[PDB]
Amino acid sequence: GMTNTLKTSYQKTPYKLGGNGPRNVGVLTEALQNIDDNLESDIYGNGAVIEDFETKIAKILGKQSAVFFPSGTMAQQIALRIWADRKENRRVAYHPLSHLEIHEQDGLKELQQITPLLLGTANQLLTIDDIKSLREPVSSVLIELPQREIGGQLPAFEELEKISEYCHEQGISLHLDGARLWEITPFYQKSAEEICALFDSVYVSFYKGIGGIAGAILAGNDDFVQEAKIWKRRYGGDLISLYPYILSADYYFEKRIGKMAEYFEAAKGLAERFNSCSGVKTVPEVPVSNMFHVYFENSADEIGAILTKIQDETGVGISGYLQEKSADVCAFEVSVGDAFAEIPAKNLELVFRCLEKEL
Amino acid sequence: GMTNTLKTSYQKTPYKLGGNGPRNVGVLTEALQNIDDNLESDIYGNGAVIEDFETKIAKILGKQSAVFFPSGTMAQQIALRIWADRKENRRVAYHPLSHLEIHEQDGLKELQQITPLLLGTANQLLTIDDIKSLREPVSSVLIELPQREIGGQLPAFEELEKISEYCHEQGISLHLDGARLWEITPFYQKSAEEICALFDSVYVSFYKGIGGIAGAILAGNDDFVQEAKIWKRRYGGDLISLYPYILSADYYFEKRIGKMAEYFEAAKGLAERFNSCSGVKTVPEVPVSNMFHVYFENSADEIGAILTKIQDETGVGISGYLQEKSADVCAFEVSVGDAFAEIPAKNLELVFRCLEKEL
Numbered sequence: 269g270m271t272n273t274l275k276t277s278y279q280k281t282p283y284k285l286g287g288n289g290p291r292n293v294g295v296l297t298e299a300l301q302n303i304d305d306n307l308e309s310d311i312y313g314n315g316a317v318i319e320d321f322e323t324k325i326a327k328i329l330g331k332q333s334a335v336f337f338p339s340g341t342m343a344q345q346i347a348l349r350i351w352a353d354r355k356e357n358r359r360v361a362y363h364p365l366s367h368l369e370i371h372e373q374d375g376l377k378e379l380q381q382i383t384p385l386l387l388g389t390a391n392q393l394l395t396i397d398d399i400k401s402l403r404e405p406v407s408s409v410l411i412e413l414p415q416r417e418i419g420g421q422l423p424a425f426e427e428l429e430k431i432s433e434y435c436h437e438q439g440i441s442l443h444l445d446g447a448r449l450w451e452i453t454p455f456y457q458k459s460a461e462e463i464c465a466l467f468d469s470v471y472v473s474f475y476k477g478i479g480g481i482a483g484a485i486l487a488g489n490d491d492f493v494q495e496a497k498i499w500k501r502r503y504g505g506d507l508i509s510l511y512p513y514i515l516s517a518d519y520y521f522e523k524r525i526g527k528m529a530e531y532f533e534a535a536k537g538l539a540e541r542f543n544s545c546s547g548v549k550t551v552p553e554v555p556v557s558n559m560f561h562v563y564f565e566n567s568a569d570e571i572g573a574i575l576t577k578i579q580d581e582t583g584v585g586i587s588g589y590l591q592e593k594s595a596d597v598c599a600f601e602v603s604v605g606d607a608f609a610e611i612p613a614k615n616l617e618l619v620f621r622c623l624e625k626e627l
Numbered sequence: 628g629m630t631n632t633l634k635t636s637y638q639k640t641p642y643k644l645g646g647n648g649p650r651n652v653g654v655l656t657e658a659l660q661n662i663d664d665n666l667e668s669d670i671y672g673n674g675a676v677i678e679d680f681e682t683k684i685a686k687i688l689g690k691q692s693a694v695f696f697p698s699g700t701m702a703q704q705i706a707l708r709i710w711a712d713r714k715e716n717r718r719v720a721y722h723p724l725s726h727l728e729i730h731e732q733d734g735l736k737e738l739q740q741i742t743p744l745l746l747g748t749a750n751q752l753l754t755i756d757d758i759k760s761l762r763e764p765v766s767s768v769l770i771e772l773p774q775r776e777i778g779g780q781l782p783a784f785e786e787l788e789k790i791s792e793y794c795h796e797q798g799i800s801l802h803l804d805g806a807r808l809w810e811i812t813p814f815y816q817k818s819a820e821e822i823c824a825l826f827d828s829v830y831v832s833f834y835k836g837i838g839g840i841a842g843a844i845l846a847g848n849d850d851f852v853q854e855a856k857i858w859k860r861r862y863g864g865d866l867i868s869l870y871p872y873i874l875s876a877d878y879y880f881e882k883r884i885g886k887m888a889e890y891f892e893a894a895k896g897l898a899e900r901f902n903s904c905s906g907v908k909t910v911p912e913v914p915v916s917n918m919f920h921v922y923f924e925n926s927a928d929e930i931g932a933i934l935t936k937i938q939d940e941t942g943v944g945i946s947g948y949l950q951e952k953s954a955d956v957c958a959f960e961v962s963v964g965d966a967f968a969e970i971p972a973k974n975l976e977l978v979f980r981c982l983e984k985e986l
């Protein structure tokens with residue numbers, strides 16, 4: 269049906285609007301080009317290769333220390349448990365579509381017996397008013413900048429300041445799900461340190477906008493990080509050797525961190541072209557990062573046929589899937605990376621000329 | 628004090644009695660030399676690179692299915708929870724020095740709310756009487772072959788059969804901590820499959836006797852493995868890309884699985900040399916695997932000085948550490964691998980003539 273035809277069409281395209289190209293073994297071998305084969309492996313959380321990377325990212329985030337984790341899934345459940353223990357309160361609060369709530373097979377609930385109170389509604393940004401309306405106290409609030417499931421939306425920076433100030437006054441710990449932190453500094457015109465300064469703890473990824481292989485850093489005060497390392501061993505995350513992910517994380521960080529503004533500008537240019545099409549809009553209308561969602565006023569079956577024809581005729585991958593939203597509405601996500609800049613101008617123009625012609 | 632002096636002396640040695648050479652980036656480089664840079668990454672537990680490896684190991688172990696985990700610490704906690712749910716019983720039983728009990732910061736207790744009953748006494752092998760004598764129902768019994776903390780001791784295969792048979796009649800799940808399973812097939816003259824046939828589930832490692840970088844396989848019935856995959860995501864172990872560990876595990880498995888008999892022989896010969904020295908004895912007296920413990924009748928500081936001198940004068944690393952057992956008794960562990968055969972005969976002989984002399 270539509271699903272498989274679109275998938276196949278997308279997979280065959282030489283060019284892609286989204287991403288950083290194929291996730292293949294070459295991503296790792298490229299990262300190892302400048303590394304000495306005699307470089308010693310880290311050993312259960314210790315050693316220059318891991319310690320130097322932790323110290324470096326901690327300094328970039330303006331925190332006392334950091335711990336390298338195999339995943340954000342592990343790291344964030346642990347962060348919330350530490351704050352629950354400090355406050356003797358197993359309730360937390362976050363957006364209904366937090367990664368913890370929907371993408372971790374209920375790990376936070378099942379492994380930590382933490383009860384998440386959902387803030388606002390699934391379709392919009394949470395606000396300070398939602399926090400003020402909580403019917404019981406919480407140990408922490410978790411904020412995801414930007415809110416990926418609603419298209420990568422952000423509150424005004426001044427509103428994040430007000431949330432931070434209120435949490436400080438009420439003794440509520442504030443944790444940053446910064447999976448896509450690097451991608452938002454251009455819009456906010458704030459450094460990573462400035463944004464993270466409003467939070468007690470922060471998690472950042474190296475495989476999202478950075479385009480590395482896998483891995484995460486959790487950062488905060490020394491005492492906090494030391495407790496996180498104990499939990500890391502409990503979770504089976506204190507692997508003997510994490511260098512394959514540390515080296516690749518550091519390589520791709522240095523390769524792509526300077527491109528965040530470029531990806532933001534590119535995403536905005538692309539969104540303008542989508543919005544110019546009849547029956548097509550983006551959310552947000554003007555991207556505030558390298559990502560956005562594209563919505564259509566037609567069913568997924570109908571749009572899939574159009575996208576397949578266009579991908580086949582231009583060689584430019586638009587999307588490998590379409591999410592059904594209502595009877596006659598569907599959508600997909602775009603995250604701009606290195607692939608966008610490789611699309612020849614003619615092919616890119618043709619995609620939209622064709623899109624405008626088919627709908 | 629001699630602790631760091633010994634450690635530095637050991638790290639400088641070009642040859643070593645134990646292990647498989649330096650744990651450096653080169654280990655990864657070598658494993659990737661014959662992999663196509665275009666080979667596609669696994670994606671959150673799916674894809675040929677991960678699926679083919681899991682299938683390969685499951686067949687070797689004689690089980691329906693297998694799941695690759697980043698760690699045995701995560702894998703085994705999960706295995707025990709699964710059996711605990713099946714039996715509605717959160718009590719388990721194992722040796723007092725099980726890895727779950729002493730090396731995982733109490734993860735089993737803290738994350739899985741399981742109560743472990745300790746079988747027998749810390750200084751010796753648990754027996755079938757210890758199991759039959761429990762007089763309280765448990766969901767599972769865990770067996771570690773060999774028992775590493777007491778020198779790598781093994782019960783007779785015939786006793787394992789009886790333990791398996793008893794647990795089967797009583798409805799008790801039997802789990803194998805097979806971190807060092809590969810190392811014991813020579814002594815038992817039984818295949819991995821024949822050993823695993825006695826157990827409901829099994830965990831095996833790829834970084835110990837195999838000498839890979841990191842990683843584990845958990846294997847058993849397909850329904851058991853599917854539940855394990857749910858828990859894997861909850862733990863933060865379902866990394867987008869595990870190929871760096873999978874490809875290296877497979878590479879070193881192929882390289883060294885056939886040398887297990889050789890390592891066993893070599894260990895026996897090395898233990899004989901240790902035992903022939905006054906003031907020195909191995910546990911077990913005769914190794915039943917590639918490993919054993921070496922005990923001395925002097926203090927860690929006194930032995931540390933001697934080993935430091937011998938290491939500096941011969942270029943052969945004996946031990947990087949000493950574990951104090953009492954004021955005047957200390958010990959270390961030796962696990963024979965590829966390093967041993969690379970020691971020139973002259974140097975090896977000089978090591979023992981010095982040990983004979985100094986003690």
Ligand SMILES: [Cl-]
Pocket residue numbers: 489490491492
């Ligand atoms: Cl703190």
Ligand code: NA
Pocket residue numbers: 300301302303304305
């Ligand atoms: Na090189």
